[PDB]
Amino acid sequence: VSSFERFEIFPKTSSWPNHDSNKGVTAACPHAGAKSFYKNLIWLVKKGNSYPKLSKSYINDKGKEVLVLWGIHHPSTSADQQSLYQNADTYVFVGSSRYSKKFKPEIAIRPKVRDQEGRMNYYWTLVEPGDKITFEATGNLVVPRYAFAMERNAGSGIIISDTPV
Amino acid sequence: KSYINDKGKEVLVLWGIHHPSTSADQQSLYQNADTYVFVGSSRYSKKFKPEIAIRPKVRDQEGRMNYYWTLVEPGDKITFEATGNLVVPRYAFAMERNAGSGIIISDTPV
């Protein structure tokens, strides 16, 4: 990468007024004992007994590509679904001029991995300079918090070794 | 609708699937808010359920339209089945592929 700049695409404080963005932490990602989560994402949970239709957009204004990543949570039980998003049936939609896809969460009980019977998928896409990317979710969306305005340097590789720098 | 390949050679079939922007646009074109499309053969089988949402404008179009293709072996049937949101074929192509060649992207004249 010949240009890498991390910025806040959807500010945590002022972008999700109707959704809770503080109790989306778990014991699966502990930070010094306490329950925490990813830094560049936000786990949006219901506020009281309500989860309205989410709809947010961002227009790439960096003159270079912007890497955006998000997540899709798939709960273990419907009781866990109702306790987090208040809606028994949900759908998530992400779309841009290059990307477009609708998501339907899958509610099922998997074997325990780090004491989690549920799963969560992770996705990524690059937004062209001057393009728009829209989000639309009735629940189960791990929303993005930080993006990355980048300009990918030409092809290179990745070395896995204990050799010091 | 069904078609039986009687051309004695492979037949290339191309169809499309439309995904409206709003449920209002959905019902305005196909009258059924919930639709499905099915295409089947001996080798191909798939069901499409349109995804309704608003995308950023591309050529002044808030909706999208995926395009699909498959081949039909000589003597095989291909069946279409749709309650809406289907761009049906009009012209097919009875073709026969020879050895592997490529595509040239150049301004050099012929």
Q: What is the dihedral of CA A140, A146, A147, A153, to 10 degrees?
A: -130
Q: Which residues of B touch A (CB under 8 A)?
A: 19, 51-56, 58, 64
Compare CB distances from A97 to B53, B54, B56 and report the shortest one's residue.
Answer: B56
Quick one: chain B helix, strand, coil %, rounded to 5?
5, 35, 55
Element (H, E) at B17: strand B10-19
Domain that holds residue A137: 1-165
* Amino acid, single-letter form, for residue A101: K
Q: List Cβ neighbours of A141 (8 Å cut-off, separation of 6 or more).
A: A44, A54, A70, A71, A72, A73, A92, A135
| Domain CATH number, residue A30 | 3.90.209.20
Q: Measured between alpha carbons, how far is residue A122 from residues A67, A71, A74, B62 in Å?
A: 13, 4, 11, 26
CA dihedral over B48, B52, B53, B58, signed as positive or negative: positive
Strand pairing category for A41-43 and A54-59: unpaired
Chain B hits for A68, Cβ within 8 Å: none
> CA–CA separation, A38 vs A57, rounded Å?
21
Say how many domains are in chain A.
1
Helices within chain A (DSSP H only): 78-85
Question: Would you state the structure tokens that stand for residue B74, as one six-digit string?
Answer: 């000589």
Min Cα distance A129 → chain B (Å) is 14
**CA-based torsion, B36, A120, A129, A158: positive or negative:** negative
Q: Give the C-alpha distances (Å, rounded to integers) separating A73 from A63, A155, A165, B62, B92.
A: 32, 33, 38, 27, 43
**C-beta atoms surrounding A62 within 10 Å:** 17
Residue listed under structure tokens 């590509």: A65
3-class state of residue A80 by DSSP: helix
| Phi/psi at A25 (5° precision) | -120, 155
Beta strands in chain A (DSSP E): 3-8, 26-31, 34-36, 41-43, 54-59, 65-74, 92-96, 100-103, 119-127, 132-137, 141-144, 146-151
Obtained via which technique?
Answer: X-ray
Q: Which of A93, A102, A131 sits opposite B56 (nearest CB)?
A: A131
**Strand partners for A56:** A135
The reply to whether residue B64 touches residue A136, judged by beta carbons under 8 angstroms, is: no
- If DSSP codes are grouped into helix, strand and coil, which group holds residue B31? coil
The half-sphere exposure of A155 on its side-chain side, counting CA atoms within 13 A, is: 0
Of all residues in chain A, the one with the smallest CA distance to B61 is A97
Do the chains contact at A97 and B58, CB–CB below 8 Å? Answer: yes
Structure-token pair, residue B14: 């191309």
Give the number of other Cβ atoms within 10 Å of residue B72's Cβ.
Answer: 23
User: What is the rounded CA–CA span in Å between residue A83 and residue A51?
Assistant: 11
Strand B45-48, strand B64-72: pairing: unpaired
Give the DSSP H or E segment for B3.
strand B2-4
Closest chain A C-alpha to B17 CA, distance in angstroms: 14
Tokens representing A31? 């930070």
Do A134 and B56 make contact, defined as CB atoms within 8 angstroms? yes
SS3 B54: coil
DSSP-assigned letters across all residues of A108-147: --PPPSSS-SSEEEEEEEEE-TT-EEEEEESS-EEEE-EE
